[PDB]
Coordinates of C-alpha atoms and ligand atoms in Angstrom, one line a residue:
Chain A
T1 CA 8.6 7.0 -7.4
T2 CA 9.7 9.5 -9.9
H3 CA 8.8 10.2 -13.5
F4 CA 10.6 12.0 -16.2
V5 CA 10.3 12.8 -19.9
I6 CA 12.9 13.6 -22.5
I7 CA 12.5 14.7 -26.1
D8 CA 15.7 14.9 -28.4
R9 CA 16.6 16.6 -31.7
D10 CA 15.0 14.0 -34.0
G11 CA 11.8 13.9 -31.9
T12 CA 12.5 10.7 -30.0
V13 CA 10.6 10.8 -26.7
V14 CA 11.4 8.8 -23.5
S15 CA 8.9 8.6 -20.7
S16 CA 10.1 6.7 -17.7
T17 CA 9.1 6.1 -14.1
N18 CA 11.5 4.5 -11.5
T19 CA 10.9 3.6 -7.9
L20 CA 11.6 1.9 -4.6
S21 CA 7.9 1.5 -4.0
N22 CA 7.9 3.1 -0.5
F23 CA 9.9 6.3 0.1
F24 CA 13.4 4.8 0.8
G25 CA 11.9 1.3 0.0
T26 CA 12.2 -0.9 3.1
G27 CA 14.6 1.7 4.6
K28 CA 17.3 -1.0 4.5
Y29 CA 20.6 0.5 3.4
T30 CA 23.7 -1.0 2.0
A31 CA 26.7 0.0 -0.1
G32 CA 25.3 3.5 -0.3
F33 CA 21.8 2.9 -1.4
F34 CA 18.3 2.0 -0.2
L35 CA 16.7 -1.4 -1.0
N36 CA 13.3 -1.4 -2.6
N37 CA 10.2 -2.6 -0.8
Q38 CA 8.2 -5.1 -2.8
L39 CA 4.4 -4.9 -2.5
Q40 CA 2.8 -8.4 -2.7
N41 CA 0.4 -8.1 -5.7
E51 CA 6.2 -17.3 -6.9
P52 CA 10.0 -16.7 -7.4
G53 CA 11.1 -14.7 -10.5
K54 CA 7.9 -12.6 -11.0
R55 CA 7.2 -8.8 -11.0
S56 CA 4.3 -7.5 -9.0
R57 CA 1.5 -5.3 -10.4
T58 CA 2.1 -1.6 -10.2
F59 CA -0.1 1.4 -11.1
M60 CA 2.8 3.1 -12.8
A61 CA 2.0 4.3 -16.4
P62 CA 4.6 6.1 -18.4
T63 CA 2.8 7.3 -21.5
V64 CA 3.3 9.0 -24.9
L65 CA 0.6 10.8 -26.9
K66 CA 1.0 11.5 -30.7
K67 CA -0.9 13.5 -33.3
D68 CA 0.4 15.2 -36.4
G69 CA 2.2 18.4 -35.2
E70 CA 2.1 17.2 -31.5
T71 CA 4.2 14.9 -29.3
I72 CA 3.4 14.5 -25.6
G73 CA 5.3 12.5 -23.0
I74 CA 3.8 12.3 -19.5
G75 CA 3.7 10.3 -16.3
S76 CA 3.5 10.7 -12.5
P77 CA 4.2 8.9 -9.1
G78 CA 1.6 8.3 -6.5
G79 CA 0.8 4.6 -6.3
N80 CA -2.7 3.6 -7.0
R81 CA -3.7 7.2 -7.6
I82 CA -1.7 7.4 -10.8
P83 CA -4.5 7.0 -13.3
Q84 CA -6.7 9.3 -11.2
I85 CA -4.0 12.0 -11.2
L86 CA -3.4 11.8 -14.9
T87 CA -7.0 11.4 -16.3
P88 CA -8.3 14.9 -15.3
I89 CA -5.1 16.6 -16.6
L90 CA -5.2 14.9 -19.9
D91 CA -8.9 15.5 -20.2
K92 CA -8.6 19.2 -19.4
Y93 CA -5.6 19.5 -21.7
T94 CA -7.0 17.8 -24.8
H95 CA -10.2 19.8 -24.4
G96 CA -8.3 23.0 -24.9
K97 CA -8.5 24.2 -21.3
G98 CA -5.0 25.8 -21.2
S99 CA -1.3 25.4 -21.0
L100 CA -0.1 22.0 -19.7
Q101 CA 1.8 23.7 -16.8
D102 CA -1.3 25.6 -15.9
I103 CA -3.3 22.3 -15.7
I104 CA -0.6 20.5 -13.6
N105 CA -1.0 23.5 -11.2
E106 CA -4.7 22.8 -10.7
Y107 CA -5.8 21.5 -7.3
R108 CA -6.5 17.7 -7.3
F109 CA -8.7 15.0 -5.8
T110 CA -8.6 11.2 -5.7
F111 CA -11.1 8.5 -4.5
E112 CA -10.6 5.5 -2.2
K113 CA -13.9 3.6 -1.9
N114 CA -16.4 6.3 -1.0
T115 CA -13.8 8.7 0.4
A116 CA -12.9 11.6 -1.9
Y117 CA -9.5 13.0 -0.9
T118 CA -9.0 16.7 -1.8
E119 CA -5.9 18.9 -2.2
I120 CA -7.8 22.1 -1.3
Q121 CA -10.7 22.4 1.1
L122 CA -14.1 22.7 -0.7
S123 CA -17.4 24.6 -0.1
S124 CA -20.6 23.3 1.7
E125 CA -22.5 23.5 -1.6
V126 CA -20.1 20.9 -3.1
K127 CA -19.6 18.9 0.0
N128 CA -23.3 18.2 0.3
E129 CA -23.8 17.3 -3.4
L130 CA -21.1 14.7 -3.0
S131 CA -22.4 13.5 0.4
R132 CA -25.6 12.8 -1.5
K133 CA -23.8 10.3 -3.8
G134 CA -22.4 8.3 -0.8
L135 CA -19.0 10.1 -0.9
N136 CA -17.4 11.7 2.1
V137 CA -14.9 14.5 1.2
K138 CA -11.6 14.4 3.1
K139 CA -8.8 17.1 2.6
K140 CA -5.3 15.8 2.6
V141 CA -2.1 17.4 4.0
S142 CA 0.7 15.7 2.0
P143 CA 1.1 17.6 -1.4
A144 CA 3.1 14.6 -2.7
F145 CA 0.0 12.4 -2.1
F146 CA -1.3 14.0 -5.3
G147 CA 1.6 13.1 -7.5
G148 CA 4.4 14.6 -9.3
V149 CA 3.4 15.0 -12.8
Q150 CA 6.2 15.6 -15.4
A151 CA 5.6 16.2 -19.0
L152 CA 7.0 17.6 -22.2
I153 CA 5.3 18.7 -25.4
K154 CA 6.9 19.0 -28.8
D155 CA 4.8 20.8 -31.5
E156 CA 5.8 21.5 -35.2
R157 CA 5.6 25.3 -34.8
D158 CA 8.4 25.1 -35.2
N159 CA 9.6 23.3 -33.2
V160 CA 8.8 24.5 -29.7
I161 CA 9.1 22.2 -26.8
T162 CA 7.2 23.0 -23.7
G163 CA 6.3 21.1 -20.6
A164 CA 5.3 20.9 -17.0
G165 CA 7.0 20.2 -13.7
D166 CA 5.1 19.5 -10.6
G167 CA 5.9 22.0 -7.9
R168 CA 4.5 19.5 -5.4
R169 CA 7.7 17.6 -5.6
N170 CA 9.9 20.5 -6.6
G171 CA 9.7 19.4 -10.2
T172 CA 10.7 21.4 -13.3
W173 CA 11.6 21.3 -17.0
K174 CA 13.7 23.0 -19.7
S175 CA 14.0 23.1 -23.5
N176 CA 16.6 24.8 -25.7
Chain B
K18 CA 19.9 22.5 -33.5
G19 CA 17.5 21.0 -33.3
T20 CA 14.9 21.3 -30.6
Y21 CA 15.1 19.3 -27.3
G22 CA 14.0 19.2 -23.6
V23 CA 14.0 17.5 -20.2
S24 CA 11.2 17.3 -17.6
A25 CA 12.1 15.7 -14.2
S26 CA 11.5 15.8 -10.5
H27 CA 14.8 17.6 -9.6
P28 CA 16.6 20.7 -11.1
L29 CA 20.0 18.9 -11.1
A30 CA 18.5 16.0 -13.1
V31 CA 17.0 18.5 -15.6
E32 CA 20.4 20.3 -15.7
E33 CA 22.4 17.1 -16.5
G34 CA 19.8 15.9 -19.0
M35 CA 20.0 19.2 -20.9
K36 CA 23.8 19.0 -20.8
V37 CA 23.8 15.7 -22.7
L38 CA 21.2 17.0 -25.1
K39 CA 23.0 20.4 -25.7
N40 CA 26.1 18.5 -26.8
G41 CA 24.1 16.5 -29.3
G42 CA 23.1 13.3 -27.4
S43 CA 20.1 11.1 -27.9
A44 CA 17.0 10.9 -25.6
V45 CA 18.1 7.5 -24.3
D46 CA 21.7 8.6 -23.4
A47 CA 20.1 11.6 -21.6
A48 CA 17.6 9.2 -19.9
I49 CA 20.4 7.1 -18.4
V50 CA 22.1 10.2 -17.1
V51 CA 18.9 11.6 -15.6
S52 CA 17.9 8.3 -14.0
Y53 CA 21.3 7.8 -12.3
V54 CA 21.3 11.5 -11.2
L55 CA 17.8 11.1 -9.6
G56 CA 18.9 8.0 -7.6
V57 CA 21.6 10.2 -6.0
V58 CA 19.9 13.6 -5.6
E59 CA 16.3 12.4 -5.1
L60 CA 17.4 9.2 -3.3
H61 CA 14.0 8.7 -1.4
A62 CA 12.0 8.2 -4.6
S63 CA 14.2 6.0 -6.8
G64 CA 17.7 4.5 -7.2
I65 CA 19.8 1.5 -7.9
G66 CA 18.2 -0.5 -5.2
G67 CA 14.8 -0.3 -7.0
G68 CA 13.5 -0.7 -10.6
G69 CA 11.1 0.9 -13.1
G70 CA 10.1 1.1 -16.7
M71 CA 10.9 3.0 -19.8
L72 CA 8.9 3.8 -22.9
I73 CA 10.9 4.8 -25.9
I74 CA 9.0 6.2 -28.9
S75 CA 11.0 7.3 -32.0
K76 CA 9.8 8.2 -35.5
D77 CA 9.6 4.6 -36.5
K78 CA 10.1 2.4 -33.4
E79 CA 8.4 1.8 -30.1
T80 CA 9.7 0.0 -27.1
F81 CA 8.9 -0.6 -23.5
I82 CA 11.7 -1.7 -21.3
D83 CA 10.6 -3.3 -18.0
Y84 CA 13.3 -3.4 -15.3
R85 CA 11.1 -3.9 -12.4
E86 CA 12.3 -5.9 -9.3
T87 CA 11.6 -9.6 -9.3
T88 CA 10.7 -11.9 -6.4
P89 CA 13.4 -14.0 -4.9
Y90 CA 13.2 -17.7 -4.1
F91 CA 12.5 -17.9 -0.3
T92 CA 11.3 -20.9 1.6
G93 CA 10.1 -19.8 5.1
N94 CA 8.4 -16.6 6.2
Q95 CA 8.2 -13.8 5.5
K96 CA 11.0 -12.7 4.6
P97 CA 11.8 -9.0 4.3
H98 CA 9.7 -8.0 1.2
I99 CA 12.6 -7.0 -1.1
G100 CA 12.8 -7.8 -4.9
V101 CA 16.1 -8.2 -6.8
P102 CA 16.8 -4.7 -8.1
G103 CA 16.5 -4.2 -11.8
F104 CA 17.5 -0.6 -12.3
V105 CA 21.2 -1.1 -13.1
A106 CA 20.4 -4.1 -15.4
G107 CA 17.7 -1.8 -17.0
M108 CA 20.0 1.1 -17.8
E109 CA 22.6 -1.4 -19.2
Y110 CA 20.1 -3.2 -21.4
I111 CA 18.7 0.1 -22.6
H112 CA 22.2 1.4 -23.3
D113 CA 23.4 -1.7 -25.2
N114 CA 20.4 -1.7 -27.4
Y115 CA 19.6 1.9 -27.8
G116 CA 22.5 4.0 -26.6
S117 CA 25.3 5.8 -28.4
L118 CA 27.6 7.5 -25.9
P119 CA 29.9 5.3 -23.9
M120 CA 28.4 4.1 -20.6
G121 CA 31.1 5.3 -18.3
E122 CA 30.3 8.9 -19.3
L123 CA 26.6 8.4 -18.6
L124 CA 27.3 7.5 -15.0
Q125 CA 29.8 10.3 -14.4
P126 CA 27.5 13.2 -13.4
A127 CA 25.8 11.1 -10.6
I128 CA 29.2 9.9 -9.4
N129 CA 30.1 13.6 -9.2
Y130 CA 27.0 14.4 -7.1
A131 CA 27.5 11.4 -4.9
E132 CA 31.2 12.0 -4.6
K133 CA 31.3 15.8 -4.2
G134 CA 27.8 16.5 -2.9
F135 CA 24.8 18.4 -3.8
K136 CA 22.6 20.8 -1.9
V137 CA 19.5 19.4 -0.2
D138 CA 16.1 20.7 -1.1
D139 CA 12.8 21.1 0.8
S140 CA 11.3 17.8 -0.3
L141 CA 14.3 15.7 0.7
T142 CA 14.6 17.1 4.2
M143 CA 10.8 16.7 4.6
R144 CA 10.9 13.1 3.3
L145 CA 13.7 12.3 5.9
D146 CA 11.7 13.9 8.7
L147 CA 8.6 11.9 7.8
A148 CA 10.6 8.6 7.5
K149 CA 12.5 9.0 10.7
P150 CA 10.0 7.1 12.9
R151 CA 10.4 4.1 10.5
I152 CA 13.9 4.1 9.1
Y153 CA 16.1 6.0 11.4
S154 CA 19.2 4.3 12.8
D155 CA 22.9 5.1 13.2
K156 CA 23.7 3.5 9.8
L157 CA 21.8 6.5 8.4
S158 CA 23.9 9.2 10.1
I159 CA 24.8 11.1 6.9
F160 CA 21.1 11.7 6.3
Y161 CA 20.4 12.7 9.9
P162 CA 23.4 14.7 11.2
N163 CA 23.0 15.3 14.9
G164 CA 20.0 13.0 15.0
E165 CA 18.0 15.5 12.9
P166 CA 17.1 15.4 9.1
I167 CA 19.8 17.1 7.1
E168 CA 18.6 20.7 6.6
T169 CA 17.7 22.5 3.3
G170 CA 20.8 24.1 2.0
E171 CA 23.3 21.6 3.4
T172 CA 25.6 19.5 1.3
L173 CA 25.0 15.8 1.2
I174 CA 27.9 13.7 0.3
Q175 CA 27.5 10.0 -0.3
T176 CA 30.9 8.3 -0.4
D177 CA 29.6 4.8 -0.1
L178 CA 27.2 5.3 -3.0
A179 CA 30.0 7.0 -5.1
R180 CA 32.1 3.9 -4.6
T181 CA 29.3 1.6 -5.8
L182 CA 28.6 3.8 -8.8
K183 CA 32.3 3.7 -9.6
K184 CA 32.4 0.0 -9.4
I185 CA 29.4 -0.1 -11.9
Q186 CA 31.0 2.5 -14.2
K187 CA 34.3 0.5 -14.3
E188 CA 32.7 -3.1 -14.7
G189 CA 29.2 -2.6 -16.0
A190 CA 26.3 -4.5 -14.5
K191 CA 28.6 -7.2 -13.1
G192 CA 29.7 -4.4 -10.7
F193 CA 26.3 -4.5 -9.0
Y194 CA 25.0 -8.0 -9.7
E195 CA 28.2 -9.9 -8.7
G196 CA 31.1 -9.4 -6.4
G197 CA 31.0 -7.3 -3.2
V198 CA 27.9 -5.1 -3.9
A199 CA 26.0 -8.4 -4.6
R200 CA 27.3 -9.9 -1.3
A201 CA 26.2 -6.8 0.5
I202 CA 22.7 -7.0 -1.1
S203 CA 22.6 -10.7 -0.3
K204 CA 23.5 -10.2 3.4
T205 CA 21.0 -7.2 3.9
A206 CA 18.1 -8.6 1.8
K207 CA 18.6 -12.3 2.5
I208 CA 18.6 -13.1 -1.2
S209 CA 20.8 -15.7 -2.7
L210 CA 23.8 -14.7 -4.9
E211 CA 22.4 -16.7 -7.7
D212 CA 19.1 -14.8 -7.5
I213 CA 20.9 -11.5 -7.8
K214 CA 23.0 -12.8 -10.6
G215 CA 20.0 -14.1 -12.6
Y216 CA 18.1 -10.9 -12.9
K217 CA 16.7 -10.3 -16.4
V218 CA 15.0 -7.3 -18.0
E219 CA 11.8 -7.9 -20.0
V220 CA 11.1 -6.2 -23.2
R221 CA 7.4 -5.7 -24.1
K222 CA 5.3 -4.0 -26.7
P223 CA 3.6 -0.8 -25.6
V224 CA -0.1 -0.7 -25.2
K225 CA -1.2 1.2 -28.4
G226 CA -4.6 2.9 -28.4
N227 CA -6.1 6.3 -29.4
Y228 CA -7.6 9.1 -27.5
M229 CA -8.8 12.4 -28.8
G230 CA -7.1 11.9 -32.2
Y231 CA -3.9 11.0 -30.5
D232 CA -2.1 7.7 -30.9
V233 CA -1.3 6.9 -27.3
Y234 CA 1.5 4.5 -26.3
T235 CA 1.6 3.3 -22.8
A236 CA 2.8 0.7 -20.3
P237 CA 1.6 -2.9 -20.7
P238 CA 1.0 -5.3 -17.8
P239 CA 2.2 -5.6 -15.1
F240 CA 2.1 -1.8 -15.4
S241 CA -1.2 0.0 -15.8
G242 CA -1.3 1.8 -19.1
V243 CA -4.5 -0.1 -19.8
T244 CA -6.4 1.4 -16.9
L245 CA -5.2 4.8 -17.7
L246 CA -6.1 4.6 -21.3
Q247 CA -9.5 3.2 -20.4
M248 CA -10.2 6.0 -18.0
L249 CA -9.1 8.5 -20.6
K250 CA -11.4 7.1 -23.3
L251 CA -14.4 6.8 -21.1
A252 CA -14.0 10.4 -20.1
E253 CA -13.9 11.5 -23.7
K254 CA -16.9 9.3 -24.5
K255 CA -19.1 10.6 -21.7
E256 CA -17.4 14.1 -22.0
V257 CA -17.2 14.9 -18.4
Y258 CA -15.3 18.0 -19.6
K259 CA -18.7 19.6 -20.1
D260 CA -19.0 19.3 -16.2
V261 CA -15.6 20.8 -15.5
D262 CA -17.0 24.1 -14.1
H263 CA -19.4 22.2 -11.7
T264 CA -17.1 20.7 -9.1
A265 CA -19.4 18.0 -7.7
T266 CA -20.5 16.8 -11.1
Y267 CA -16.9 16.7 -12.4
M268 CA -15.7 14.9 -9.4
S269 CA -18.8 12.6 -9.3
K270 CA -18.2 11.3 -12.8
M271 CA -14.4 10.8 -12.3
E272 CA -15.2 8.7 -9.3
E273 CA -17.4 6.6 -11.6
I274 CA -14.9 6.4 -14.4
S275 CA -12.3 5.3 -11.8
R276 CA -14.2 2.3 -10.3
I277 CA -15.3 1.2 -13.7
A278 CA -11.6 1.0 -14.8
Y279 CA -10.2 -0.3 -11.5
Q280 CA -12.9 -3.0 -11.3
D281 CA -12.0 -4.0 -14.8
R282 CA -8.2 -4.2 -14.0
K283 CA -8.9 -6.4 -11.0
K284 CA -10.9 -9.1 -12.7
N285 CA -8.0 -9.2 -15.2
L286 CA -6.0 -10.4 -12.2
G287 CA -8.8 -12.5 -10.5
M294 CA -3.2 -12.3 -23.6
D295 CA -3.6 -9.0 -25.5
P296 CA -3.8 -5.4 -24.0
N297 CA -4.5 -3.7 -27.3
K298 CA -7.9 -5.4 -27.2
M299 CA -8.8 -4.1 -23.7
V300 CA -8.3 -0.6 -24.9
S301 CA -10.2 -0.4 -28.3
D302 CA -13.3 1.7 -28.9
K303 CA -15.4 -1.5 -29.0
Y304 CA -14.0 -2.9 -25.7
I305 CA -14.5 0.5 -24.1
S306 CA -18.1 0.5 -25.7
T307 CA -18.8 -2.7 -23.8
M308 CA -17.8 -1.2 -20.4
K309 CA -19.8 -0.1 -17.3
Ligands
LIG1 N1 0.3 5.0 0.1 C1 1.4 4.3 -0.6 C2 0.9 2.9 -1.1 C3 -0.3 3.0 -2.1 C4 -0.1 2.2 -3.3 O1 -0.8 2.5 -4.3 O2 0.7 1.3 -3.4 C5 1.9 5.1 -1.8 O3 1.3 6.0 -2.3 N2 3.1 4.7 -2.3 C6 3.9 5.5 -3.3 C7 5.1 6.2 -2.5 C8 6.1 6.9 -3.4 C9 5.5 8.0 -4.4 O4 6.3 8.7 -5.0 O5 4.3 8.1 -4.6 C10 4.3 4.7 -4.5 O6 4.4 5.3 -5.6 O7 4.6 3.5 -4.5

């Protein structure tokens, strides 16, 4: 899965996420490309996906954002948008913050945490687990246009060697 | 001039996107270029054998294009769990309805990377190493020269893929959904020719909501814009941001917000999305 964002001259924003489901899909390979894997979630129907390309708009601000990472997608994006809207700092900075996701009473962590914290969370029935794969926590890609004047900025997720540019 | 930008998961996709934009192209022409580039240079994560979705928001228009893979007709079991790919149909639809530049040109930078090669990065070599136990075979020899994952810095060239991309560039979607590429898909995936040929894109209205003063546009079912927007609005309502400096609290509340929204999503599988995302619907949640 991969997500990208584009903003053009007259402030059109595209926010798009494409995928094979698994890495390499089923791994089956023909005429130069990998065939998708279809997760079972009747003939011509599409399955549910957690993917969520999104745009945010205020007066003087346009945000496009999204991320891979399967069923962790809303968990990846919620804290970032939360921190960001509450003035906590530059979008890139926030993308850089260490991350956690939950799977039914297991909290998965990007960076290993203190005893203090591990106990407090043990008390709520959760058992912290640190995870090795940096890609497990997504690949958030975002752009921001503001009307000062205008400046585009954005974020690329170094966990998937992601990046961004504006003129 | 005119401000513009690209954010994407590979520097060559960012580079090609900016190229189109630099020369005055639209965000959707740039989007087709980036998507095709990504299927070549970040082949593990997306490509013509998959699908996806696109949100297009302009000054006075909103669209969500859904080009996700669809289930084939299949009578026994299992079969291989492969949908009819929707990616190539998606770019075409998007181009015909929202593009300006001619399509051939939009495919060209990906063709060039497939044809002449690009330099492999960390993540690709790592992805190949992690997938080797599952996918490795001799058909995949360009990706594993000398039985090992192609190393960072090496040039990967994809002549078969270049050929396919050229067939699409010359013929349009027919080049993928009919003819030889379609017979190859049919033989590998065990999907009928008529199934491949019948693929259709779905156009849908974005989920529209608001969060923190923002109008938010996002992906409607079968995508999960709803869950995300719900999570966002719950978090703003019960400002867990006031707990951001206390790790266990912050985490604790996110964990709650997330089962609230995932539970909701699930009993919506076990017809208006704009309703499920309003301050009142969110009010009624726990
Ligand atoms: N662990 C898998 C399946 C979990 C799921 O939610 O379906 C996973 O995370 N798959 C992802 C692999 C590719 C990526 O870029 O994240 C996916 O997005 O489907």
